[PDB]
Amino acid sequence: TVTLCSPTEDDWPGMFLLAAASFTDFIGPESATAWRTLVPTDGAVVVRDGAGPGSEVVGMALYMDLRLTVPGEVVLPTAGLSFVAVAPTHRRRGLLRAMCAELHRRIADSGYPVAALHASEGGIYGRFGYGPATTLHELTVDRRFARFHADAPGSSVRLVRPTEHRGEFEAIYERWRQQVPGGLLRPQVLWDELLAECKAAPGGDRESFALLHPDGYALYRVDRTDLKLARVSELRAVTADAHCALWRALIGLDSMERISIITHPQDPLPHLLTDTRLARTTWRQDGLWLRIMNVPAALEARGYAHEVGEFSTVLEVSDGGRFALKIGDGRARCTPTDAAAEIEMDRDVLGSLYLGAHRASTLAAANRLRTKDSQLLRRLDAAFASDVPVQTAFEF
Amino acid sequence: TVTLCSPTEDDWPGMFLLAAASFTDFIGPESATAWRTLVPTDGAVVVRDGAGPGSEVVGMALYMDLRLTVPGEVVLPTAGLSFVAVAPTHRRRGLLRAMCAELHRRIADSGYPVAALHASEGGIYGRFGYGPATTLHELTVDRRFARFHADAPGSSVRLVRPTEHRGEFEAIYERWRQQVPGGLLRPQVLWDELLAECKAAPGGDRESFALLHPDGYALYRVDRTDLKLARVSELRAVTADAHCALWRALIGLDSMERISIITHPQDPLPHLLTDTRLARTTWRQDGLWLRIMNVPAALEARGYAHEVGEFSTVLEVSDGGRFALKIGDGRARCTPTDAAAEIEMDRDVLGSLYLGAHRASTLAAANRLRTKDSQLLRRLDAAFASDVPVQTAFEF
Amino acid sequence: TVTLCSPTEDDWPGMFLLAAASFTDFIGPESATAWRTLVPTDGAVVVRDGAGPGSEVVGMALYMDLRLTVPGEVVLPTAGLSFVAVAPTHRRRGLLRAMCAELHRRIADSGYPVAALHASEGGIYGRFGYGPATTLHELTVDRRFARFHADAPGSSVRLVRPTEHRGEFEAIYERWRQQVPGGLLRPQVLWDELLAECKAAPGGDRESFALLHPDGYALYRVDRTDLKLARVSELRAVTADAHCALWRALIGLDSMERISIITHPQDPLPHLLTDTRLARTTWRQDGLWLRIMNVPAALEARGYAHEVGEFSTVLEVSDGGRFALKIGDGRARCTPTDAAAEIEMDRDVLGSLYLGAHRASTLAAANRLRTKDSQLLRRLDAAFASDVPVQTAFEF
Amino acid sequence: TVTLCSPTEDDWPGMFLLAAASFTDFIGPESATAWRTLVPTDGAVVVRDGAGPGSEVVGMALYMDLRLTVPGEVVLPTAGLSFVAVAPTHRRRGLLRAMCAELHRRIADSGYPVAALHASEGGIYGRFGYGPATTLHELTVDRRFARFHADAPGSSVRLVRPTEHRGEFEAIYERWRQQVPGGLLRPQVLWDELLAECKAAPGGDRESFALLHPDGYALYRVDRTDLKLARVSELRAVTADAHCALWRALIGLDSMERISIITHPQDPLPHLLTDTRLARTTWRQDGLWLRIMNVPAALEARGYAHEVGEFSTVLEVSDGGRFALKIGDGRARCTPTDAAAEIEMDRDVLGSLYLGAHRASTLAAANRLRTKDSQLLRRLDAAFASDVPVQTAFEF
Amino acid sequence: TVTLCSPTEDDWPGMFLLAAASFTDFIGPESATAWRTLVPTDGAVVVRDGAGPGSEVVGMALYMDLRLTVPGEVVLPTAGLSFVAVAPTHRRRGLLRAMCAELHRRIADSGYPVAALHASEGGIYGRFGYGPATTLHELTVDRRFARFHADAPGSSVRLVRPTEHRGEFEAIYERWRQQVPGGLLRPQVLWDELLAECKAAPGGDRESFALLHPDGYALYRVDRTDLKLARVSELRAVTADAHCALWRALIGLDSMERISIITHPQDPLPHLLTDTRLARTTWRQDGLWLRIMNVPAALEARGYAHEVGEFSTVLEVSDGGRFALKIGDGRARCTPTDAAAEIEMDRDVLGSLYLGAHRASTLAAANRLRTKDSQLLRRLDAAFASDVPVQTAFEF
């Protein structure tokens, strides 16, 4: 009946159709064919219904080749899952399990230490070993009241047409993504896509503008629905100076009542202002999800906090191996063992800890993470934290 | 014209009137006379307009004697400011500055290391040296979809009439407030007040119920405005088991669509569920604000993280003294010095760091906190963190 | 651990507490003690948690002795389930199954042909053999535009204080409930309850008024939330004349913009007006649910349409017996058999057909009701229909 | 001053202008020129203001040649009124009466037994003898909770691009419209129009998709305003199997929260689900309106229920003739007479009964329909009912 | 650093960019290049940031050459400020003061007696001597209830395509603007702009229609957001007959529930109807703002009410000269003096009085306008009033 296989070029139109019916944002396929360049040979799986010549697609999934920055400014090859979809006609038939299992084998065999995704819903991917690893934080600032604090840094920012400063944006983003956990390399093809969206579309979005600083930029747009709201679609700042100068400019949009931005929980913006409330948290949600494919490769690859003293323990990941884990001097050694476990957790929990967005002690309080001693917990909690707060790059 | 002095009993009615006109929640005065028992002799200041027999009150402020738990389970005498109010007729005349200055002298001279408040607005109290020190986090759970995770702990909880289990609530809260930074001792008079509110009021709030566990409780009520919403006014859990069992009971309120609660950012509830999104953050705001009155007394009183190795630095608080600050083995020594400062911050910033709710590195990114080296920052950031996440007790 | 038994008077307070926590409308218990008089000795079951002296109630259910009118103006003893509740602490432990099974045995053994309920949710009771048997239909009339049709009947109606015309209301309701399927006898104790609600409550509902006609009445109130909306809580009309005259009076409430009423789908009101749209359907929902306890007793008790010619068939109710069903001259004979079934359905489907609110052919289209021939379907569909449209009496 | 006449081609632009100003949906005229092919020579009337060369149009009306299915699967030539409009400058001058009178003479003389329309408002057309004859029923399903009942039928449905399966849609619709009262033949020109709308329009509607089954289809689209709502613009199912399979697919649109559809009151969807409430009635309204042009031709043309035994009566339609009406064996004979009337009604009432959407007994309760005996009423009510529930085809 | 100068053609693109970022309505620049023809040589100022070749624009402002009608049907050369904008990066640096000061010198030296603007916010321009001089009044009529009064005048109005009756619109507007204070000459280039907007835009506004009378017109459109709302974008009526006939036509839009229009406070529409409430005031706001450049030229140019008897006084405008003001026979003489002032006001107050939209006595009650005697006040109040109520022409 159902067969699982790598798509042919003859499978494309079926895939585009399924995609269009599954993702509202989809159209255009032309953009789909930009992301396609990020898909390695054999990075795609489809499920066909039946057998014969061109039987219809009813399931699809793929991964893209990505570079993710993890704490200690270390960059990992990362397999980014996307365009995962099952036909509304074939829902509870195990297609998602089969497609994910097949994709994970390929990802493992190809040597990725880590896989990642953005979840359309929050209850799907834990079962596959993905844990929420970054946190999206919407701030809406009522700029009518906003005054900067005497201490705040600061002219240096220019109001600019996005399409005329691509080189400057690329260089800034590139510096940004290398320094911040969560950072993703943004390939030329994605800069084409992003740059194009800047022009106003009738019936769609208004034209975008940019605020450019030698060390950061912001891209923003008036909201279509509300005309006193400015939406900051992206703000990449490499220094604190740039971050503040950009916000002085945004708060300068006197035509507006409110500025909103999707940011991270440690965004220092509230502290730039004399009234920290004006920077109001309007929304929160999981951002990037991680599946640790290879536990020791991943644990050894990232840097750890230097503050915690050297310690050793035994970590067991449910159906993922048991390891002697030694952390000291910001570095980890992670070797096979059969000594008794001191800590245990499912694979997804590990991905949630990995970039420091969640504290081990919080996971432990929910019993996801079982441990021997509170001391070990406090150490796992200090070691795994990140000097530079974790942020989210572009969705995929 | 205006005179500042300690109220007489002849000043009360004026004060009640001003209070009623300044705080919507005020009425009843009868409750005002419960909190009055918490006000020390000389803990109150009023401003009278003119001179003569019973000239009208136009300004008032006071503090209450409180016990606040800070990291390391250390309990500090704390002066809690409340009922601070200026007549709408006397707004920009310096009454608030005068009343706060006078109150702070009294508080300092009386030996409180720390003062605290809940802010009616976010832009008033920084100028007086108070910094936001805890964070309120509203979670609304759509319990229709909520399923507990296989790992989650768990019968043990009873549905109970609040008024018939005061002794059990008192003992549980008492254990709770001694273990959690942000915890406040709740005196008998406040248990009278809180217990009374439990009965339904016509035109007002519906009757409250309680979920009682040997190690925790929750008090809740159906919302007046929305009848598919259950409001958890208070949940105190001393163990993780109790926390989970209480939430299994709340999610058990099948008559409801949504449960909301004002909680703290590290509440582990999202991780009890198979879909972490269901536990949605609907609101965020500063909770308790702190003014460090005596810097060395306060810095020496609290415990510090054991993970960070011993280090020494020089801390300068703007118009608050310069100190040689030595932290090691979870303990701090804080002595006078005139050596060059390595770190500087206004007083309010220090109160924001004090319970660990804000990271020094985030304050530094906003330039509030100026420092010499990033290393010192990472250390100040690890040392000041709290093993047990900071929570908020009752507003005052 | 858990025990199922008939409540003692010592179990009451536990039951009241559970009730209060399960039903928002509950309070007052004093009203609970009116309905209690409708509960037969042994009509109540509770589940206690554990054993000992006064272990806490965690489950309760009961039935009331009612008289229900079914097509052909036949009145059946009916067991009305209500106050069914499981503690939020004991949700998926089978308490509802156990309590319902126990109650049904008692109801069967006591000789009720039928049981009934109003469902708090639509997905609970089918599993217990109850089917939706009446349909609530909210109409909101924009009376600003409403003009009566030249044909409409029609002075005879008086604006009246409800509390001063109880005898007239009782007599009218009594005539009403004897003629209409869905009609329930309303005992003196329920007239006390209903009459009391008429007075305005501060913070609650405004005072009610009545429109009285020799052959019908309406009770109404201005909405608390909206002051241009009049809510008709009850309209009982015994003749078409009375129905029209009452509506001319209601449309006469010039102080109002809208009149709403919960009515039945065949309410002729739309056809009284020159613009049938003004009578807008704002809400629809299942009303009374029926469980046929004794199939042949129930099928033989009701009248059937005289129009359909005599026919015979074999009806099988899943786990409910197989019967030779003979319908002719508005009367049915229903005898045991083992001949092959011509029609099959679960018990709940039968309750849905029983008062004529649902057509057999519609149930069959959804495959709930499996039959041999379309002819039999059309006959079952004509025979079971009701001359007088089915209406809903008071909720319980 | 005003003249009434058949439009010239020189009158078109005036007519298009009036149309554009009267119907928001109008534009495009290009579509107007598709429907024009359905307009018979002499099926159009305009009113010109004054006399001379090209005096301006101020009134227009026309009818289209249609085929309507009535109970017993009988197809009648039907004159469909549309594009009826009076200039805002000439409102109460009798233009609508004059245009309708003129159109009706033409329709009568041409031999249509029946005329039909969709009403822009509910209070206009009764005066012209049209009665509401079908009922639109909006159901919104919260598909997040929807589970199918164990009994429900059921793979067989494919997700499909509408534009690539026209032949299959045509054949299915054609079977559908021949079996269902309310069915209209959909000519090739209307399939061109409908097929075209399927593509996404910027600023307008998103692209449509189809679910195709050998025996039915559904066309749907995400809502422009709300992105968690899927709108089913059309669902034609010829068997119950197809109807259920299509709904399993729609409930399979996991990307959505709600599915809505405009359907008929006997849609069996609620009964496919374990919780019948999920299929919520959000809106109700009159669909197709009928004017019986020739009473005996129309009464003799349709089939009647076989269940009711043969009976005879005398029907008088106000200003529409008196007839001896004999119904038996699903067939009616309708002859002229002057015997005393047993039943009387206006013409519009008859159109409301004609397809079985309204019961005679309900019309009688509102006094529109005056009759001699209740027995005759029950018979008129059983005879006129429809085996197959009446549905609405495309608006016109 | 910053330089203020007349833009080059090389400065345009910078100016367009700033414009686009400052005004949501901006795009298109192509329209900007229509208004440009209204800008005199030297009517534009820009601020450049720095010095060099093509340094970026950060501030811009200009004025257009306009003709404004003032009471007594006198037409004044008026400098109309628009496209005033400061970069969000240069907000509190005095750019607006510098640009306005420079523009005012040019305007004064060029011989304009008056300058005018439409304010983006209400708190900016008083400091520059502009006072609100006309009042926008939104009326929303619920046309479902609207009946005209027996007295109301009144066929004569035609429903018309705007683009086909430009000549008639021009002539009518031209008569209108010459008779009404607030009237502006509308140049051919602005008729091109306005005429173009009439066509429907996908994703944007629906197509406009016109109601044409020999002595007036209305342009209207269905609202994009709400489809039962008709928006009257413009109604110019030269006689009362035309005004009433146009409103009879608008109330004739039976497809609509509501008609809205931005009008003036003395619009007689409410008095045409039997229920004056139906014409509901939904919004009010300042329209045109005036700066009197040359006090005596302006005071002598306008007509004054003939009713008030001749009187003389001494008027002082803060930093604007002192004048002996003599008003009699609808004419004023305004000569220099140093006699003591009898009345004093800031310049902006004078602009607010100038077209009669505000009464001197109301300004005096707010103490803006200080005077010697109440008698003088009553005279200044009668003299300055306008026979013909002041209206607002097109925004600029």
Query: Nearest by CB to A88, which of D200, D207, D252?
Result: D252
Six token digits for residue B41: 């002799």
Q: What is the CATH number of domain D292-387?
A: 3.30.1050.10
- Cβ contact A40:A151 at 8 Å: no
Residues of chain B by 3-state class (helix, strand, coil), percent to 5: 30, 30, 40
In the DSSP assignment, the letter for residue B54 is S
Experimental approach taken: X-ray
Six token digits for residue C274: 């020159």
- Tell me how long chain A is: 396
Residue D241: partners with Cβ closer than 8 Å, 6 or more residues away: D153, D154, D156, D215
* Beta bridge pairs of residue A188: none
- Cβ contact A222:A189 at 8 Å: no
For residue E125, indicate whether it is catalytic. Answer: yes
| A-E contacts (CB, under 8 Å) | 48
How far is A332 from A297, CA to CA, in rounded Å? 10
- Give the Å distances, CA to CA, from A268 to A217, A237, A241: 16, 12, 12
Stretch 121-180 of chain D: residues touching chain C, C-beta under 8 Å: 121-123, 126, 132, 145, 149, 151-153
Residues of chain A by 3-state class (helix, strand, coil), percent to 5: 30, 30, 40
- Cβ contact B297:B113 at 8 Å: yes
Catalytic pick from A125, A128, A169, A217? A125
- Closest Cα partner for C64 from C99, C98, C40? C40
Residue C105: partners with Cβ closer than 8 Å, 6 or more residues away: none
- Closest Cα partner for D275 from D142, D376, D157? D142
Residues of chain D by 3-state class (helix, strand, coil), percent to 5: 30, 30, 40
- Cβ contact E29:E15 at 8 Å: no
C-beta atoms surrounding B120 within 10 Å = 11
- Cβ contact D132:C276 at 8 Å: yes
Resolution in A: 2.5
H/E element, D233:
strand D229-237
How far is A237 from A247, CA to CA, in rounded Å? 10
How far is C147 from B71, CA to CA, in rounded Å? 74
- For an interface test with A, give the residue of D217, D248, D255, D257 to mutate (most A CBs within 10 A): D255
How far is D264 from D267, CA to CA, in rounded Å? 6
Residue E291: partners with Cβ closer than 8 Å, 6 or more residues away: E104, E114, E115, E116, E117, E125, E128, E129, E130, E131, E347, E348, E351
- Cβ contact D275:D302 at 8 Å: no
How far is C337 from C321, CA to CA, in rounded Å? 9
C-beta atoms surrounding E149 within 10 Å = 12
Six token digits for residue D192: 């061109």
CATH 3.40.630.30 segments of chain B: 1-133+287-291, 134-286
Q: Which residues of A participate in the annotated binding site for acetyl-CoA?
A: 84-86, 92-97, 120-121
Residue of C nearest to D384 (CA): C382
β-pairing, A114-118 vs A288-292, is antiparallel
| A-D contacts (CB, under 8 Å) | 47
Residue of E nearest to D55 (CA): E158
- Give the Å distances, CA to CA, from E370 to B171, B373, E131, E311, E367: 70, 63, 17, 18, 6
Q: Does the annotation flag D138 for ligand binding?
A: no
Chain-centre distance of CA C25, in angstroms?
A: 18
Six token digits for residue C173: 């309701």
- Cβ contact D179:D238 at 8 Å: yes
**CATH top class, domain C134-286:** alpha beta
How far is D379 from D313, CA to CA, in rounded Å? 10
Which subunits count as partners of chain C given 3+ CB pairs below 8 Å?
B, D
Q: A253 CA to chain E: closest CA distance, Å? A: 5
Residue of D nearest to C272 (CA): D366
Six token digits for residue B235: 């949940």
- Residues from chain A that touch B310, judged by Cβ atoms under 8 A, are none
How far is D184 from D243, CA to CA, in rounded Å? 19
- Residues from chain E that touch A248, judged by Cβ atoms under 8 A, are 89
H/E element, E284:
strand E279-286
CB contact under 8 A, D254 and A23: no
Stretch 291-310 of chain D: residues touching chain C, C-beta under 8 Å: 305-309
Question: Burial of D336 by CB count in 10 Å (0-12 exposed, 13-18 middle, 19+ buried)?
Answer: exposed
- Closest Cα partner for B288 from B180, B139, B174? B180
How far is A70 from A75, CA to CA, in rounded Å? 6
Six token digits for residue D296: 């005996």
- Cβ contact D336:D342 at 8 Å: no
Number of helices and strands in chain C (H, E) = 10, 19
- Give the Å distances, CA to CA, from B158 to A36, A366, B173, B200, E13: 57, 21, 17, 21, 72
Instruction: Match 């699903």 to its residue by tokens.
Output: D330
Looking at chain D, after which residues does the C atom sit over 2.5 Å from the next written N, breaking the chain? 154
Q: Does domain D1-133+287-291 have CATH number 3.40.630.30?
A: yes
Residue D278: partners with Cβ closer than 8 Å, 6 or more residues away: C122, D141, D142, D143, D145, D146, D270
- Residues from chain D that touch C272, judged by Cβ atoms under 8 A, are 366-367
Query: Nearest by CB to D253, which of A17, A18, A88?
Result: A88
Q: Provide the 3-class DSSP secondary structure of residue E212.
A: strand
CB contact under 8 A, E207 and D20: yes
A and E touch per CB criterion (3+ pairs under 8 A): yes
Number of helices and strands in chain E (H, E) = 10, 19
Q: Is C310 left (phi over 0), alpha (psi -120 to 50) or beta?
A: beta
- Closest Cα partner for E292 from E234, E354, E203? E354
CB contact under 8 A, C89 and B159: yes
How far is D316 from D322, CA to CA, in rounded Å? 4
- Cβ contact E396:E383 at 8 Å: no
Q: Does the annotation flag B120 for ligand binding?
A: yes
Q: Does the annotation flag D67 for ligand binding?
A: no
* Beta bridge pairs of residue B309: none
Residue D237: partners with Cβ closer than 8 Å, 6 or more residues away: D176, D213, D215, D216, D243, D246
How far is B313 from B293, CA to CA, in rounded Å? 21
CB contact under 8 A, B153 and A378: no
Six token digits for residue A173: 């983003």
Helices (H), C275-388: 295-301, 347-354, 360-365, 374-383
Catalytic pick from E112, E125, E130, E169? E125
Six token digits for residue C188: 């003196």
In the DSSP assignment, the letter for residue E339 is S
- Residues from chain A that touch B132, judged by Cβ atoms under 8 A, are 276
Instruction: Match 């003036």 to its residue by tokens.
Output: E264
- Residues from chain E that touch A252, judged by Cβ atoms under 8 A, are 87-91
H/E element, B152:
none
Cα angle B92-B95-B99, degrees, rounded to a multiple of 5 = 150
- Closest Cα partner for D60 from D22, D33, D26, D92? D22
- Residues from chain C that touch B200, judged by Cβ atoms under 8 A, are 27
Query: Nearest by CB to C27, which of B159, B203, B207?
Result: B207
Residue C392: partners with Cβ closer than 8 Å, 6 or more residues away: C134, C135, C136, C182, C262, C264, C287, C288
* Beta bridge pairs of residue A86: A59
In the DSSP assignment, the letter for residue E32 is H
Which subunits count as partners of chain D given 3+ CB pairs below 8 Å?
A, C, E
Establish if B225 touches chain C: CB-CB under 8 angstroms: no
Helices (H), D36-110: 95-109
Q: C9 CA to chain D: closest CA distance, Å? A: 36
How far is B283 from B267, CA to CA, in rounded Å? 14
- Residues from chain E that touch A158, judged by Cβ atoms under 8 A, are 56, 89
Residue of D nearest to C370 (CA): D151
- Cβ contact A323:A295 at 8 Å: yes
Q: Does the annotation flag D6 for ligand binding?
A: no
- Closest Cα partner for E238 from E182, E176, E180, E178? E176
Stretch 233-292 of chain A: residues touching chain B, C-beta under 8 Å: 240, 243-244, 266, 268-269, 271-272, 274-278, 280-281, 283-286
- Closest Cα partner for E280 from E260, E297, E300, E256? E260
CB contact under 8 A, E202 and A202: yes
CA atoms within 13 A on the CB side of D370: 10
- Cβ contact D178:D185 at 8 Å: no
How far is B15 from B285, CA to CA, in rounded Å? 29
Establish if C20 touches chain B: CB-CB under 8 angstroms: yes
Q: How is the beta sheet containing B331-336 ordered, strand by strand?
A: B331-336, B321-328, B311-317, B343-345, B370-371
- Tell me how long chain E is: 396
Catalytic pick from B63, B112, B125, B304? B125
Residue D31: partners with Cβ closer than 8 Å, 6 or more residues away: D193
Establish if D390 touches chain C: CB-CB under 8 angstroms: no
C-beta atoms surrounding C375 within 10 Å = 12
C-beta atoms surrounding E25 within 10 Å = 8
Catalytic pick from C63, C125, C209, C384? C125
Amino acid at position E383, single letter: A
CB contact under 8 A, C88 and B159: yes
Q: E210 CA to chain A: closest CA distance, Å? A: 25
Amino acid at position E83, single letter: F
Q: What residues of D are annotated to the active site?
A: 125, 396
- Cβ contact D82:D64 at 8 Å: yes
What phi, psi does A251 have (nearest 5°)?
-60, -25
Chain-centre distance of CA D117, in angstroms?
A: 7
- Give the Å distances, CA to CA, from A265 to A12, A142, A260, A282: 40, 18, 14, 12
Number of helices and strands in chain D (H, E) = 10, 19
How far is B301 from B297, CA to CA, in rounded Å? 6
Six token digits for residue D224: 């422009």
CATH 3.30.1050.10 segments of chain B: 292-387
- Cβ contact C326:C332 at 8 Å: yes
H/E element, E140:
strand E135-142
- Cβ contact C78:C112 at 8 Å: yes
Residue C324: partners with Cβ closer than 8 Å, 6 or more residues away: C312, C313, C314, C334, C335, C336, C337, C339
Burial letters C284-306, b for 16+ CB under 10 A, else e: bbbbbbbbbbbbbebbebbbbbb
Q: Does the annotation flag D84 for ligand binding?
A: yes
Burial letters C219-257, b for 16+ CB under 10 A, else e: bbbbbeeeeebbbbbbbbbbebbbbbbbbbbbbebeebb
- Residues from chain A that touch B120, judged by Cβ atoms under 8 A, are none
Question: Burial of D154 by CB count in 10 Å (0-12 exposed, 13-18 middle, 19+ buried)?
Answer: middle
Query: Nearest by CB to D227, which of A18, A20, A24?
Result: A24
